[PDB]
């Protein structure tokens, strides 16, 4: 789910960049170091609002190292999945152990043990799919799934979905 959050970043600048263009350079450095990153605490930062008018304040010189430390506060759009949430998805891969879907930047893996039994995996089909009499879910097929668990990594998030309840599966 997408949100607006007020975040802050600590930026350290080398003395070789102490020029008139210091502020703009700090702005592009912030944009390059925040746009697209993935933090387990917050999720995924997709964009920074008002990216060219961010206040940086006054940097403090670190005693003994010369480099200046800047405290940058900004508002950004953040997306983070939650346990027990039902969202739309697009299937990216089909495999005997289960199928992998994509919910924005997040890639969700659904095991066969969380798939209804009638959706038997068909490897002979082109492309291979988990199909039933009235349902056929393959690569590129819209699916509505509920996120059950989320795994936190260093700079990545792994989520597990399920389609075993009602109003789920193919859409």
């Amino acid at each position: 789910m997408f949100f607006l959050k007020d975040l802050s970043l600590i930026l350290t600048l080398h003395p070789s960049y102490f020029g008139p263009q210091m502020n703009q350079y700090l702005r592009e450095k912030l944009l390059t170091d925040v746009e697209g990153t993935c933090t387990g605490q917050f999720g995924y930062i997709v964009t920074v609002l008002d990216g060219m008018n961010i206040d940086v304040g006054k940097g403090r010189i670190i005693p003994g190292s010369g480099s200046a430390e800047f405290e940058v506060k900004y508002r950004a759009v953040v997306w983070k999945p939650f346990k027990g949430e039902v969202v739309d998805a697009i299937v990216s891969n089909v495999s005997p152990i289960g199928f992998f879907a994509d919910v924005g930047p997040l890639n969700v893996f659904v095991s066969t043990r969380l798939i209804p039994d009638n959706l038997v995996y068909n490897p002979s089909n082109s492309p291979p799919a988990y199909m039933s009499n009235d349902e056929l879910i393959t690569k590129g097929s819209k699916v509505r799934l509920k996120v059950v668990g989320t795994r936190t990594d260093v700079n990545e998030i792994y989520a597990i979905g399920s389609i075993k309840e009602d109003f789920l599966g193919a859409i």
Binding site: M1, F2, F3, L4, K5, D6, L7, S8, L9, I10, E28, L31, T32, V34, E35, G36, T37, T39, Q41, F42, Y44, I45, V46, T47, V48, L49, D50, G51, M52, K73, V77, W79, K80, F82, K83, G84, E85, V86, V87, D88, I90, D102, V103, G104, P105, R144, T150, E165, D166, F167
Partner: protein, 174 residues
């Protein structure tokens, strides 16, 4: 890396059950609590975003940045290519693809009317912003379907759920 405006949170002895993330129970944790603080420390509400609002905001910000980088002189692929960072480019491409392929409302005025309906309504004055975002995003059609998908709305029976759903379906472009 990035630090939230909420700090402190030192050691204690009591342990609470409203600490674990759970969408059904509407327990979003401390960093996503209902009450937030801005850079001035004033009171602030949690700001959820539906796919329509998120798409509008991301498109506006990206096109503003693209115009600024060209000296103030539309395509999603070009707009994604505007940003810097190969991984950032891929992430914004994936988010844009998701938003485009599931955009319930691609018009500013439709989204504005939807937000006005979901905010100014007397029944919706109690609705949690997460519930509002889920309703505007999943595009549910039935009261039973919405309740099954959103367990929180089951306990809120003072909501004109069916007619609001029909209003959303009407506002949804066929």
């Amino acid at each position: 890396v990035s630090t939230s405006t909420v700090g402190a949170r030192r050691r204690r002895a009591k342990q609470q059950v409203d600490d674990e993330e759970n969408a059904t129970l509407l327990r979003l944790g401390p960093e996503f609590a209902l009450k937030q603080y801005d850079h001035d420390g004033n009171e602030h509400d949690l700001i959820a975003l539906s796919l329509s609002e998120s798409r509008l905001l991301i498109r506006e910000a990206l096109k503003a940045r693209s115009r600024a980088r060209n000296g103030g002189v539309i395509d999603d692929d070009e707009l994604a290519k505007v940003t810097s960072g190969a991984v950032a480019n891929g992430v914004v491409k994936k988010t844009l693809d998701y938003l485009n392929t599931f955009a319930r409302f691609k018009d500013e005025e439709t989204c504005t009317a939807v937000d006005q309906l979901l905010h100014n309504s007397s029944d919706c004055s109690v609705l949690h912003p997460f519930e509002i975002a889920q309703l505007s995003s999943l595009g549910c059609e039935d009261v039973d379907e919405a309740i099954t998908l959103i367990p929180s709305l089951a306990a809120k029976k003072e909501v004109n759920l069916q007619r609001i759903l029909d209003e959303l379906n009407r506002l949804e472009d066929p």
